[PDB]
């Protein structure tokens, strides 16, 4: 229980979140995504995904500096006759490859999608529109979206949701950064990547879909540098 919100667990690097506001930092439920047979994966950025969550987003945009750990709870239930496996990875500094011949050309509005996040692709497509480039991420699942083999992503803090065994995953991420505190609007400290390690299947049904829900609670929150409100440009 954290605040008025209530409900194996993995503590990233064995380090519980710690201090170097209090009401605002509680469990928030993002929009549900649909796991299909042909799904490739999903990603979110923290604190970006929580930027429109009650008082936590207000504190994000009213302060120059902020820091927080997180507790991420992935929820996905199915029957005993379903099969499939998900890998949930927490990546510090989760930089994703772009889609253009120009290096680092992804624009701010696409790098910070919010609680909807983005999806991995099965292959790499190069954006050719030069007059109006998309300037979006093109994260390939087997390259883990950053030019590394997804099979080695298990070096990151992670959990596995095997449908025959468990239906939930819990990751406790401490604040990780080269600084004690940073700008929450400039920098995403954590990334969450969910990849289907084993494809979803249900007997004699090429139609089954099951929901995945993420609930994220910021922890050990600190804010500093109160000023007027930041209003980032949107697309």
């Amino acid at each position: 229980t954290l605040g008025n919100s209530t409900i194996n667990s993995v503590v990233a690097y064995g380090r519980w979140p710690e201090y170097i506001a209090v009401a605002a930092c509680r469990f928030y439920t993002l929009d549900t995504v649909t796991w299909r047979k042909e799904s490739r994966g999903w990603w979110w950025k923290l604190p970006d995904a929580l930027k429109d969550m009650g008082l936590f987003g207000q504190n994000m945009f009213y302060h120059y500096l902020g820091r927080a750990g997180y507790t991420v709870h992935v929820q996905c239930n199915a029957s005993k006759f379903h099969q499939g496996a998900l890998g949930v990875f927490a990546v510090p500094e989760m930089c994703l490859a772009g889609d253009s011949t120009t290096h680092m050309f992804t624009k701010y509005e696409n790098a910070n999608p919010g609680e909807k996040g983005g999806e991995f692709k099965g292959s790499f497509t190069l954006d050719t529109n030069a007059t109006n480039p998309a300037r979006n991420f093109c994260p390939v699942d087997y390259l883990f979206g950053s030019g590394v083999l997804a099979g080695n992503a298990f070096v990151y803090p992670h959990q596995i949701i095997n449908l025959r065994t468990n239906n939930c995953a819990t990751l406790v991420l401490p604040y990780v950064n080269s600084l004690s505190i940073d700008s929450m609007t400039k920098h995403n400290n954590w990334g969450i990547a969910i990849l289907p390690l084993a494809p979803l299947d249900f007997a004699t049904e090429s139609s089954t879909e099951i929901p995945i829900t993420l609930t994220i609670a910021p922890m050990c929150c600190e804010f500093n540098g109160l000023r007027n409100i930041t209003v980032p440009r949107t697309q």
């Binding site: 990233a12 690097y13 064995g14 380090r15 005993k80 006759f81 379903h82 099969q83 499939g84 496996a85 510090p92 099965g122 699942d141 087997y142 083999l149 997804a150 099979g151 080695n152 298990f154 070096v155 596995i160 095997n162 449908l163 025959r164 065994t165 401490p174 990780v176 950064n177 080269s178 004690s180 990849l195 289907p196 390690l197 084993a198 494809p199 299947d201 249900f202 007997a203 004699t204």
Partner: protein, 234 residues
């Protein structure tokens, strides 16, 4: 001044030397470190992390996610192997690009035990027993469960538990093996077989996937740092 005599090796630059040099920014006030999570002291700590094995490197599967999945079915029992692996953790293409293999490709000599974990990703209604075997080198590679049973092995009941670990203990004539394909320092064979068949009830998927992970044990060590073949510049 003091009489001195210049020995051979004077004025050479050895890139592996350990010498003092003058500081180009004296009296710099260095930023103190903070307690960042996830500090690493030894590269072996990374080799001791389980990473998924790209076992299914077929023409249509390599360089996709399908290369990580090995398919089982509920067909009748057979003695044909499910998977066959060479115990060459740095030169076998299926182990070379795991975290363990990537670390090994920066060194010339390796020794120590290995850990292979297998995760069954079928329905909860599926049952079956599998045999996982390691054969030390020297004989022909086992092609049936009869030959595989003679080596080290474990029996995995998926119904009882969804993940099973087999430790391959260090057994070598030499004190270290080379990180390349070499007959004199060959490692052996890892094989998987059906002990019984996989059984499912009705209204259940009849095909399912297993996944493989490999890591090093606490007795693992490497020697003779060297450049890798996994990165090149054009």
């Amino acid at each position: 001044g003091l009489p001195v005599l210049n020995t051979p090796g004077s004025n050479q630059y050895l890139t592996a030397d350990n010498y003092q040099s003058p500081c180009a920014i004296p009296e710099f006030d260095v930023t103190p470190p903070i307690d960042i999570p996830g500090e690493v002291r030894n590269m072996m700590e990374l080799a001791e992390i389980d990473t998924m094995i790209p076992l299914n490197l077929t023409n249509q599967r390599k360089n996709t996610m399908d290369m990580y999945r090995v398919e089982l079915n509920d067909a009748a029992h057979s003695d044909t192997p499910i998977l066959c692996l060479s115990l060459s953790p740095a030169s076998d293409p299926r182990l070379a690009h795991t975290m363990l293999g990537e670390i090994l490709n920066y060194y010339t000599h390796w020794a120590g035990s290995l850990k292979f974990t297998f995760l069954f990703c079928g329905s909860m209604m599926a049952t079956g027993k599998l045999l996982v075997s390691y054969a030390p080198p020297g004989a022909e590679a086992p092609k049936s469960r009869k030959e595989a049973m003679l080596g080290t092995h474990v029996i995995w009941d998926i119904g009882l538990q969804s993940s099973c670990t087999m430790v391959v203990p260090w057994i070598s004539n030499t004190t270290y093996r080379l990180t390349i394909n070499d007959s004199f320092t060959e490692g052996g064979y890892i094989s998987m077989f059906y002990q019984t068949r996989v059984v499912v009830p009705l209204s259940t998927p009849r095909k399912m996937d297993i996944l493989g992970f490999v890591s090093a044990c606490n007795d693992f060590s490497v020697r003779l740092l060297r450049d890798t073949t996994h990165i090149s510049q054009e």
